[PDB]
Curated annotation (Swiss-Prot):
It comes from the Bacteria. This is Phosphomannomutase/phosphoglucomutase. Mg(2+) binds at residues 103, 237, 239, 241. GO terms for biological process: alginic acid biosynthetic process; GDP-mannose biosynthetic process; lipopolysaccharide core region biosynthetic process; O antigen biosynthetic process. Residues 370-448 are annotated as: Topological domain 4. Its cofactor is Mg(2+). Binds 1 Mg(2+) ion per subunit. Zn(2+) can substitute, but yields a catalytically inactive enzyme. It comes from Pseudomonas aeruginosa (strain ATCC 15692 / DSM 22644 / CIP 104116 / JCM 14847 / LMG 12228 / 1C / PRS 101 / PAO1). Residues 154-250 are annotated as: Topological domain 2.
Length: 458
């Protein structure tokens, strides 16, 4: 084996630019590393899927050949959403699965999301794959390939379990990503009228990029929902493990508010169930889960990390601010925007109120938008650490799982380091304006105690 760039081996995935940091050869040796790791955990059987990127149909050939050259039995599910690959890794013979995807990123990117013997890899497990390649610590064998058509089965699984009470009219925006293969069709079959936006699978991404996380990528959805007097809008990211939600009046429903509703529902049938959310999610969600008789568990951001935490705690539901929603009740416990969409429509169809009122009934607190402060790559983590070390927070309940979150009786604030950019990311909330200013002040003062030069835009 040759020398691969370490920079493509990231915290919860592998991601690079095709023809650049990610070549055909690279993808082969990754298959080889993944195949050897799966065999070491006693799993020869591996499912493989591709998203709808331009480099997909050719580049998976190297991944599959990598796996085959280990002795693995590969089940090739073709072009499918990311959660449909996770699904195959749950219902097929093997518990290993590789998804060739570049998520919500620009066309030239691709990469791998990896499940080995039930375990979604992260951090050190991913570095171990690179290390296997470098060390030439690789299995050798004459493997196997089998074509598997899994989408009709996934489709039937969801349709059979979802019970919609009334018809709804829904705008669906796939952003020309791979969710277009199943989302509009599934939602139609649930008993809805679907208004398709950008559901043709096109790896050029000729319209907006399939990233519901940037509000500008939601404009067309909002305009269409309003103009068609639709009951809801849904936006999927490129690979389908993420969903964005807008109401009949075009209100963006952030994932923590979405979680409030799902938690009410899941906990109602499951007294005492654990429910996971990340450090960026509103305090109201803590209260709400507890009030309904569930056990709230705050965890780290990162799909691989939430999914691990779910197995460790038995949690029936998890979600995070980026829009990954993980159902275990009635499901398999992986993040799936398409299944979450269905679960949302099921609940909404059972309410006589419009979606705007279902979500607004949870009420509000005084909230800031997410605040970004560009720092440097050199100082990024050291500022968080200086805070974790020296900052004075008074009587706050301090969480240092991921940056520094402080929960006070009447509100909270968070500051964390961006993992991919030289940026500090902050959020604040409180039940009054006067309290929000007090918490902002506490964070402003503690940052200025670190570096009196830091630009604090609040
Ligand atoms: Zn995604």
């Amino acid at each position: 084996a040759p020398t691969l760039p370490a920079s493509i081996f990231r915290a919860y995935d592998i991601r690079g630019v095709v023809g650049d940091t990610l070549t055909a050869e690279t993808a082969y040796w990754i298959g080889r590393a993944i195949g050897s790791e799966s065999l070491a955990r006693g799993e020869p059987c591996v499912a493989v899927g591709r998203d709808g990127r331009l480099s997909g149909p050719e580049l998976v050939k190297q991944l599959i050949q990598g796996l085959v050259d280990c002795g693995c039995q590969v089940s090739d599910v073709g072009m499918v959403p990311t959660p449909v690959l996770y699904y195959a890794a749950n219902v097929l013979e093997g518990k290993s699965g590789v998804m060739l995807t570049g998520s919500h990123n620009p066309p030239d990117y691709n990469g791998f999301k990896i499940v080995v013997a039930g375990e979604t890899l992260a951090n050190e497990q991913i570095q171990a794959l690179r290390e296997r390649i470098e060390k030439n610590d690789l299995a050798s064998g004459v493997g196997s390939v089998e074509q598997v058509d899994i989408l009709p089965r996934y489709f039937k699984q969801i349709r059979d379990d979802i019970a919609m009470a009334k018809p709804m009219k829904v705008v669906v925006d796939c952003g020309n990503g791979v969710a277009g293969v199943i989302a509009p069709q599934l939602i139609e079959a649930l008993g809805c009228s679907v208004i398709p936006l950008y559901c043709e699978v096109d790896g050029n991404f000729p319209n907006h990029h399939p990233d519901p996380g940037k509000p500008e990528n939601l404009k067309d959805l909002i305009a269409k929902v309003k103009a068609e007097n639709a009951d809801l809008g849904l936006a999927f990211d490129g690979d389908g493990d993420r969903v964005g939600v807008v109401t009949n009046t075009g209100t963006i429903i952030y994932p923590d508010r979405l979680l409030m509703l799902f938690a009410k529902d899941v906990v109602s049938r499951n007294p005492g169930a654990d429910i996971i959310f990340d450090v960026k999610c509103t305090r109201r969600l803590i209260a709400l889960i507890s009030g309904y008789g569930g056990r709230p568990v705050m965890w780290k951001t990162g799909h691989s990390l939430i999914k691990k935490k779910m197995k460790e705690t038995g949690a029936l539901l998890a979600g995070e601010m980026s829009g990954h929603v993980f159902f275990k009740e009635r499901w398999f416990g992986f993040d799936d925007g398409i299944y979450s969409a269905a679960r949302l429509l099921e609940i909404l169809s059972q309410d006589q109120r419009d979606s705007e009122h279902v979500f607004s009934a949870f009420g509000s607190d005084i909230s800031t938008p997410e605040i970004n402060i560009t720092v440097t790559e050199d100082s990024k983590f050291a500022i968080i650490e200086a805070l974790q070390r020296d900052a004075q927070w008074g009587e706050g309940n301090i969480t240092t799982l991921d940056g520094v979150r402080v929960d006070y009786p009447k509100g909270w604030g968070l500051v964390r380091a961006s993992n991919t950019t030289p940026v500090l990311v902050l959020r604040f909330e409180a039940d009054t304006e006067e309290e929000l200013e007090r918490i902002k002040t506490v964070f402003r003062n503690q940052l200025k105690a670190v570096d009196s030069s830091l630009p604090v835009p609040f």
